Amino acid sequence: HVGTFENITAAPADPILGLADLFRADERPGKINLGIGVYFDETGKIPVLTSVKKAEQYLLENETTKYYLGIDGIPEFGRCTQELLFGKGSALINDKRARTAQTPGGTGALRVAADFLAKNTSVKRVWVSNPSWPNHKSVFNSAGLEVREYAYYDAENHTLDFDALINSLNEAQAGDVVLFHGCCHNPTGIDPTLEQWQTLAQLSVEKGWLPLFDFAYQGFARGLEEDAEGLRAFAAMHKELIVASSYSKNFGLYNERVGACTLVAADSETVDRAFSQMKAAIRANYSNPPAHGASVVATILSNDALRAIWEQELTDMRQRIQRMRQLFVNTLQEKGANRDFSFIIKQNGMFSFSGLTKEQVLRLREEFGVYAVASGRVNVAGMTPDNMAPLCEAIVAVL
Amino acid sequence: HVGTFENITAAPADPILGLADLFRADERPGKINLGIGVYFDETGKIPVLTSVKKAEQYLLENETTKYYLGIDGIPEFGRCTQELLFGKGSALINDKRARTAQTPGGTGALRVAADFLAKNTSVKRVWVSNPSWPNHKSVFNSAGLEVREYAYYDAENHTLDFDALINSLNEAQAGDVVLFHGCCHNPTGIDPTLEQWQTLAQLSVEKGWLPLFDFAYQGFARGLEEDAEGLRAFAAMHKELIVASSYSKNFGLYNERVGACTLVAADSETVDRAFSQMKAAIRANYSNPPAHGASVVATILSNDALRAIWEQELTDMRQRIQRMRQLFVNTLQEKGANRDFSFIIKQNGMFSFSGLTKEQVLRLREEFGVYAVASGRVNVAGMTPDNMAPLCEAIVAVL
Numbered sequence A, B: 001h002v003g004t005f006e007n008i009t010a011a012p013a014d015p016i017l018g019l020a021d022l023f024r025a026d027e028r029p030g031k032i033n034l035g036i037g038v039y040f041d042e043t044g045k046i047p048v049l050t051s052v053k054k055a056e057q058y059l060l061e062n063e064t065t066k067y068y069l070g071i072d073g074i075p076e077f078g079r080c081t082q083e084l085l086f087g088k089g090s091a092l093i094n095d096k097r098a099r100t101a102q103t104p105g106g107t108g109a110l111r112v113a114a115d116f117l118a119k120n121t122s123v124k125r126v127w128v129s130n131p132s133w134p135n136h137k138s139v140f141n142s143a144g145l146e147v148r149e150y151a152y153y154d155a156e157n158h159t160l161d162f163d164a165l166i167n168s169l170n171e172a173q174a175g176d177v178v179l180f181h182g183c184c185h186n187p188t189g190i191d192p193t194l195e196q197w198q199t200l201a202q203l204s205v206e207k208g209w210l211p212l213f214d215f216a217y218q219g220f221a222r223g224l225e226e227d228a229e230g231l232r233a234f235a236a237m238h239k240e241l242i243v244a245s246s247y248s249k250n251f252g253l254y255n256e257r258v259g260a261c262t263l264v265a266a267d268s269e270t271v272d273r274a275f276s277q278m279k280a281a282i283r284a285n286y287s288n289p290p291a292h293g294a295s296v297v298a299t300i301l302s303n304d305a306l307r308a309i310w311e312q313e314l315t316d317m318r319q320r321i322q323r324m325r326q327l328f329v330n331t332l333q334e335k336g337a338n339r340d341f342s343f344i345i346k347q348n349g350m351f352s353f354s355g356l357t358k359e360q361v362l363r364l365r366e367e368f369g370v371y372a373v374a375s376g377r378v379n380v381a382g383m384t385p386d387n388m389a390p391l392c393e394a395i396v397a398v399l
């Protein structure tokens, strides 16, 4: 009998995680990693936060069981997540209109929402920005949903093309899902202004879209509360919305897989009915979520002293990135770039669209050992005072 | 516009996890939990193994980063898993015919296999024992696979109905998946003998089935090596197979979600091609797996001292369950049961199929505070010297 696996064709590499694999294999001592979106400190390490180490020490000495969590995970994790998203006294919370499931990462939260929608509703289509995180298409396609692209980035002026965005989204019908990044747009670093958010919120209700927010970077743009303003403007207006959030980056907890999928409906009875189906989709996927990372997050947010430490550590990460954006721009001019790179200062979060071509990015890797994503997305949080000079000399050499 | 969530139908409660919720809500003193398949110790607690605490201490002191694992997880975890399943000197390992992905629990391994098969092969149908773990059907159905049932249990003789099993698999075609429990069948506790496994292995290769093994209880029947004899009979004869394994129960690591999906193909080049697509299916689901639980397992399995502790702790658990089996039978007799429950002593693992009707299980819950799954499955590992007599009086009362 001819084997079931004989005719399988190999998958292409992941544009982000395959780049990381090349980086590990590169033998050259001076290689620079500006690929995957993780935070590096000044010394070029990816450290464990001090708030996290303290919480893990508490867990080690006080955990008495590894008994299964419920399908939706740790209750306090869910409540603390809703408060971070919608605010201490939100009406969504007091009206019991939101339910949260702890998930394995923000990716897990996106797939759970996708599965939930495809199996329980009439949704067929998800609208994603052009460009976006590459894995968005793969998540939604694997759940059986069609993916459509709306306009976003103006590459000539390095800005949000708000007119193009609104014209492209006039083709999105009622009952379609539209995906927004909450803040720190991946890959462009360009977010809407509050006014623009408010314009989209009203347009969204008028046209009957189902908004889905991907919130992987809360706290890296301006602050925990400030970064949620766009989401809260939507939440004041809509009867239904979905939030897939991640704690991978703002807690430095990447490999423990800590995220949430939050469901909002018109009233408490509807959201409970809908959440029963979300729990079924989870049970048929990974059954119930991993405890260690979520327990760390809930321990930190629940304890005023740890939370104080964590917010300061997050502030330090946000400010180190802003210092590198400035240093990057200044050093490019010193190293002989005659192009204006000022737009990089106006971008938020870890990433900037460098403007480099695929051929230039390929040269940076092969000839200079500098690793960026083929779209020209560069991880500013991968820049340090020590690698800035070689990094900028390499960029000027390929311009 | 009308709400997207309004036409949603509520999902029923999970037959196992809903029971556990009912048990938590019950305020009657003396209630007894014989539902979900976790190990309880002699005091009715669900403890953390000593080997696990020691391993977690080492991780706390020595971890310097939470940087993302690769899509397929910790490499040493995969190699140690293959040795456990196939034996230290297996030809499968020497010929590099197997690849292992670390997954979030045994459920996550099953789902990853289902998504991989549905998208990359012409597999359309999965055959599962009747009865089986109720979540099997949900997992494969979530990928759009048809699930059929084969005969398994002789409810009259409390034995494997091997003749009916053979006859009911007559219509399973070449390229169909046939699912086998590796040991400690859930829910019946009845496993094939070695000769029966050898007969099934021959039949499987003649009919061209793709075998898929669900190994959630390795070490709870007779021992770690003995419990894998049936898998290893299949492995000696098949070019291709899939193994979904769990460390939830044999490490008491339930809520850390530690499992593995192992792919076996004819040769190294084929399994690597196939495994590239299994990685693509993981990336579109939860991206990469949770580190803490698998790090514990890998640390214990890699260190001779910790491993000898763990193997003794697993022996202790296995032996406690076997003593409860014998105590359960003796105490039913002392409390006046006329039905013969001797078959309980012949069954393996945590569960016995008691033979109680749905009506009798409901009476036990409502009238006596005794919680079993509605199929009559009772968790013997939830019985203690302290709750044995009240439990047995309750059962006798409903017979």
Ligand SMILES: *Cc1c(COP(=O)(O)O)cnc(C)c1O
Binding pocket: A037, A104, A105, A106, A107, A108, A133, A181, A186, A214, A216, A246, A247, A248, A254, A257, A258, A259, B286, B287
């Ligand atoms: C990192 C990221 C994710 C995935 O988060 P994980 O917690 O690693 O699964 C999802 N969306 C965006 C935009 C991201 O940047």
Ligand SMILES: *Cc1c(COP(=O)(O)O)cnc(C)c1O
Binding pocket: A286, A287, B037, B104, B105, B106, B107, B108, B133, B181, B186, B214, B216, B246, B247, B248, B254, B257, B258, B259
């Ligand atoms: C417990 C169990 C599973 C699920 O294992 P997890 O690691 O908890 O996801 C799968 N199959 C069987 C037969 C089980 O008993």
